[PDB]
């Protein structure tokens, strides 16, 4: 069954005669919803996907230079010029260099000097805008502990369809009213994805290119180092890969995954309202399971203090009510604690069918009691309704 | 001639009858040494090279992972084990994961989990120890303004040979006594070299390998990210290239060059002592240049306020003394200022030979006077001995 093994598991109880139940859905989390005379339901958020995202800005984190050229003038002959100064693909810088008789000038003193290089981007990171209108939440709704699908439903929630109705066979129907970023971008850097704040992403000190789309880079000087060697010559060297520095600057930032055109979100929470009104209990008109039950394995405690029990039923008596409870004294068999797998029913009309049960035992000593009469099975339990009523067989 | 065009140029004056002159030699710098009745000498530090350096430590700045494996145990079954835990090539991490009926365990709760990956270094930076005993300084010594080598000497200074003697032909000999790091390393990262402090280099948060040379890396965890995804699984991803982050962390650090086995230093200074004792003036026994001088181009001011003059001498009269000075009044021709190209002599016995002169003019108005009598050449000069004496020709 669902939720039993989950560490991040929530237990929500709906009021008697109530219609709505408030639920908060986390990634890798389960919510077990219980209600008086209603079946216990499991609600889990499977996936959160953002699709059709528009590119807002690209940043160069690894670059390469080529086609280097230089120009210089004599001390009073004005500023140095290169055709590459007008080319957007070229990164250029103007300085002053020592000129004189020894290097082709009639005068001594500082002369203008320009250096140019063709900038090429080797690797880039992209930032995409998250549209709240293109979000897709995939929720799983299950009847907690129904026999082995009819009793489970996969629903898709979107701003276009924030209201969904799930049919759970003989357990009726369940309604979901949910509320599916205003300052977040979707960052992609070499198959690694992140959710970053608009302000931080805008201030990145790397060569950039805004919008869609050879290309033309702005602030190419961020990955290109222009050095002045003792006022004798100007050198140009590319800085190298910044992905590691960007990674460290992304300390504590939210991660993400890919699906080709859709981006899977690994974090966030979804607030919902559950319409319990149409949920119904299965087997209110059934007879009680008369044959013997046997434990297929020893009962085990979950991470939340509850007890999971697997039983095999020897009977062939169609769909019947499973007698299951906990008692502190074996004489009067007064019910203690409660059943999470509320009002359990066997659906199989064939022998030795299996059933999974979940009980919420009281604190201290108690017994797990499955079945009725002499053929009933017991197991002592130590910690730290939902049970079908029946006549006295003892 | 040397030093005239150099911006970082020093002028040092030696006392009359003096033996030693203290000099500090910088990279891309010139020192013009002047002394009474001695030839003017140019001293320049050409190269500083450190050879035969022993490797002290290698740091991985870009890595790659492969051969990923995992192992897990059930809640009470103890710690997870992999053979890769004992392998030095493998980076491993132990954690706790949710275990239960749904994933192969009889009990629910946290179970031990280990994850391993084969670490491979793609790119590395090396740190080498600078031995003071393996330093080599190459110094250039020139006679400042001698005619067009005999009057120049290339000397090599090492801790093995910190004393050197340079022969300058007819200008005698010159002695050099110099003093050729205790907390510095030679860093190499993808053809780029640096001089870094021992303390900083030792604290680098990257996978390392000490000494010579499967290889075996320590602190592989610095480039490998082990993530825990909602206590359900452990992921392993390599961080990527750190060269950019290392580059930025090397803010203000000294740079360097290569020669295959030798490392060129672009910074530092060399303190020396010059033995002026054996230096002699050329042409004290020569006659005066009787023929006419002509300016080959207009005199030019250097970056240090001095004046450079190029003259052509029409005479065929062998080696003679060049009449050159500055005067404020053309009548008495009393010498003002001084000559940097002290006691100039023509060596060529062939006509129209060329000579370069350097004068230190007084402040304000003065005249450059080359030659004697009616055939002498003049040029007016405005700013902001070393002259051969001769009889009156005026």
């Amino acid at each position, epitope marked *: 069954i669902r939720c039993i093994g989950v560490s991040n598991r929530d237990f929500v109880e709906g009021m008697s005669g109530g219609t709505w139940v408030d639920v908060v859905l986390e990634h890798g989390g389960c919510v077990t919803v219980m209600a008086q005379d209603k079946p216990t339901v499991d609600i889990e958020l499977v996936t959160t996907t953002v699709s059709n995202m528009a590119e807002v800005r690209s940043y160069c984190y690894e670059a390469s230079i080529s086609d*280097m*050229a*230089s120009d210089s*003038r004599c001390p009073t002959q004005g500023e140095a010029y290169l055709d590459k100064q007008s080319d957007t693909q070229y990164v250029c810088k103007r300085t002053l260099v020592d000129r004189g008789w020894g*290097n*082709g*000038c009639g005068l001594f003193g500082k002369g203008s000097l320009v250096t140019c290089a063709k900038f090429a981007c080797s690797k880039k990171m992209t930032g995409k805008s998250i549209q709240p209108e293109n979000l897709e939440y995939r929720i799983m709704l299950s009847v907690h502990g129904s026999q082995h699908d009819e009793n489970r439903a996969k629903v898709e929630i979107t701003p276009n369809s924030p209201r969904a109705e799930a049919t759970l066979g003989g357990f009726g129907s369940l309604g979901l009213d949910c509320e599916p970023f205003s300052d977040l971008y979707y960052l992609t850097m070499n198959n690694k994805h992140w959710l970053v704040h608009k302000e931080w992403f805008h201030d990145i000190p790397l060569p950039w290119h805004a919008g869609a789309d050879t290309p033309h880079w702005n602030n190419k000087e961020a990955l290109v180092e222009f050095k002045d060697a003792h006022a004798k010559r100007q050198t140009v060297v590319v800085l190298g890969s910044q992905e590691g520095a960007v990674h460290t600057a992304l300390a504590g930032a939210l991660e993400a995954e890919m699906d080709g055109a859709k981006g899977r979100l690994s974090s966030g929470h979804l607030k919902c309202r559950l319409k319990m009104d149409k949920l119904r209990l299965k087997g209110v008109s059934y007879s009680l399971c008369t044959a013997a039950f046997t434990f297929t394995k020893i009962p085990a405690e979950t991470l939340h203090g509850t007890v999971t029990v697997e039983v095999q039923y020897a009977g062939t008596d169609g769909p019947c009510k499973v007698p299951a409870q906990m008692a502190v004294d074996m004489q009067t068999l007064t019910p203690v604690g409660r059943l999470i797998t509320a009002n359990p029913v066997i659906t199989e009309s064939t022998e030795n069918s299996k059933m999974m049960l979940e009980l919420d035992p009281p604190f201290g000593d108690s017994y797990i009691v499955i079945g009725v009469g002499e053929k009933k099975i017991t197991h002592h339990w130590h910690r730290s309704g939902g049970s079908w009523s029946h006549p006295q067989f003892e | 001639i040397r030093c005239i065009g150099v911006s970082n140029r020093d002028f040092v004056e030696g006392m009359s009858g003096g033996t030693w002159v203290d000099v500090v030699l910088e990279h891309g710098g010139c020192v013009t040494v002047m002394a009474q009745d001695k030839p003017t000498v140019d001293i320049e530090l050409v190269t500083t090279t450190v050879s035969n350096m022993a490797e002290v430590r290698s740091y991985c700045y870009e890595a790659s992972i492969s051969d990923m494996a995992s192992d897990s145990r059930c809640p009470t079954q103890g710690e997870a084990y992999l053979d890769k835990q004992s392998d030095t090539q493998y980076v491993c991490k132990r954690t706790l994961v949710d275990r239960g009926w749904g994933n192969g365990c009889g009990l629910f709760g946290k179970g031990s989990l280990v994850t391993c990956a084969k670490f491979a270094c793609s790119k590395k930076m090396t740190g080498k120890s600078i031995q003071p005993e393996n330093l080599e300084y190459r110094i250039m010594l020139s006679v400042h303004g001698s005619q067009h080598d005999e009057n120049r000497a290339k000397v090599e200074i090492t801790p093995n040979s910190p004393r050197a003697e340079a022969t300058l032909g007819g200008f005698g000999s010159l002695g050099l006594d110099c003093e050729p790091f205790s907390d510095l390393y030679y860093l190499t990262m993808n053809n780029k070299h640096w001089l870094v402090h021992k303390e900083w280099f030792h604290d680098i948060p990257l996978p390392w390998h000490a000494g010579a040379d499967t290889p075996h890396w320590n602190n592989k965890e610095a480039l490998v990210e082990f993530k825990d995804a909602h206590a359900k699984r452990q992921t392993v991803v390599v961080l990527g290239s750190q060269e950019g982050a290392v580059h930025t962390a090397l803010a203000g650090a000294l740079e360097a060059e290569m020669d295959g086995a030798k490392g060129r230093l672009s910074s530092g200074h060399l303190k020396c002592r010059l033995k002026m004792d054996k230096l002699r003036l050329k042409g004290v026994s020569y006659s005066l240049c009787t023929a006419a001088f002509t300016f*080959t181009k207009i005199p030019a001011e250097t970056l240090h306020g001095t004046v450079t003059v190029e003259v052509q001498y029409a005479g065929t009269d062998g080696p003679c003394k060049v009449p050159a000075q500055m005067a404020v009044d053309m009548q008495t021709l009393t010498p003002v200022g001084r000559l940097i190209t002290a006691n100039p002599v023509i060596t060529e016995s*062939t006509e*129209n030979s060329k000579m370069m002169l350097e004068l230190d003019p007084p402040f304000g108005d003065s005249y450059i006077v080359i030659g004697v009598g009616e055939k002498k050449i003049t040029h007016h000069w405005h700013r902001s001995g070393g002259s051969w004496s001769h009889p009156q020709f005026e």
Partner: antibody
Amino acid sequence: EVQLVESGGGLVQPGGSLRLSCSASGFTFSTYSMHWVRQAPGKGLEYVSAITGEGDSAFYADSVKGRFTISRDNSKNTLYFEMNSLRPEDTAVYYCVGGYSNFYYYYTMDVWGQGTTVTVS
Amino acid sequence: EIVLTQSPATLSLSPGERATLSCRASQSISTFLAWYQHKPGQAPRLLIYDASTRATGVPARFSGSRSGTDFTLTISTLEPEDFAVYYCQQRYNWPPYTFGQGTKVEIKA
């Protein structure tokens, strides 16, 4: 003795490619700026290209700009001239010229190669 | 763009005679002018640099002179080996280090 021995010359088609080489000996190659000078039949000498000693900066005349590429390998002591999109106007004897330089492309004294002939028909 | 204009186009002389070759620069280039000798089947040979400095092994009969933007190469007494094409080359500031069109020094009929 200081020498420049060139090769790579030959007969080529219009729009074709060719690569010239110029091997150097008798001097430290990195201390010399290298230049390409050409002479078309019946014409004078033409300065077309230049490269600094370290090979970090290159110059091209408007006549060869875009089509021709100058390069050097200081470990191999060789100068190269990649010629693409060759026109009949490019038919000439090509000379590699070298001169000791301590400032970009400037030189006083020089050394010339024997010359190699490039023909475009 | 610096232009060098050589004159005359052809100089027809006998051995022993004086050859005076001219080169005018389109603008002031100080003394950054070189002279070359070019014989058939041979590469050009540098004769003079810095307008008046004779290169290594260049004989005394070759001399360079200058008056403003006007440059002169004089071959005082022509020897049989001096009949060739002569070029001037400007080396002012930055490339192109342009050449003159050339002067042919030919044997007189």
